[PDB]
Design a binder for these strands. Structure first.
Lengths: 76, 77, 77, 76
DNA sequence: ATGTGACTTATAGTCCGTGTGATTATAGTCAACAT
DNA sequence: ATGTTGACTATAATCACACGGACTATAAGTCACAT
């Protein structure tokens, strides 16, 4: 697997939780598949930017906040 | 098309020129086709995080540094 | 345009495919531009004996056997 | 300089002589410059196929006969 | 609720080639004077 | 006759790039069945 990919996924999971969402609800909100999301969170998926963008919409988080977070997460 | 993509697209080119690289050099070190590097910069193609990671390694730049410039380009007017 | 040129350009391609090479290998091995190899085959282009020699070295072929295949191509109907 | 380019030039000179032609006449017959011809024969020019072709027409020699000769000259 | 697996279908990514403006090196062509 | 030296100017040859079609790998999106 990839280092970045795991932290993207970790971040996605982090934010979903800090907000109190279920996967079911992140899937609904972003108009994507729930198993799709589960896959990403166990990090069994290699998103495209577009997909990442949809997940950010679903999380209701701007690109900037996401990347600010991803950076922080990246530095152990 | 996509907001984030053209930003990612823009930043890949910006860095590449800042480092005096050519598409040929880049696609070189990213072990992607020079067609793909062109494709990305040209028509903001929808790359995968893994591919983006390869390009970062190609640009001889870190995850962090890239995303910090990404944030800057998004914030601009 | 020129009789001999399209014969030369035909034979460069023939050999290139016979040896299972691609254009951009040959462009490397011949120590000439990517687009020049294309341009020679694609249209014809008016190359120099020195450049022709480089290509022959690149096709991994001798002056002699090149010209022998050149003669054969000229002689065709 | 180049081996091939030398043998080419030598051949051009050879054929010119076996036909009893002067350079002046070889240049008239192919409409090129006499100093141009001179230059090739003293191996100071790297001609293009197009030019080579004009010289063959000026020598009144077919492409095939030229290369047949060029091959033989190439083999010592 | 979340996590599998496995199975299509869209598309990301590859591979080989075409065609092009802009710049640099050099062949094409023609002087003057040689011998 | 041929040789040589500068020249000017056409174009060979370079360099960075765009663009397309066809093919291969894989992400996108949806089932069934776990827990």
């Amino acid at each position: 697997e990839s280092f970045l990919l795991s932290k993207v996924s970790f971040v996605i999971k982090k934010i979903r939780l800090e907000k109190g969402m279920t996967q079911e609800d992140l899937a609904y909100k972003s108009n994507l598949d729930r198993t799709y999301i589960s896959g990403i969170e166990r990090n069994s998926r290699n998103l495209t930017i577009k997909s990442l963008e949809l997940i950010m919409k679903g999380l209701e988080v701007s690109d900037v906040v996401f990347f600010e977070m991803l950076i922080k997460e990246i530095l152990k």
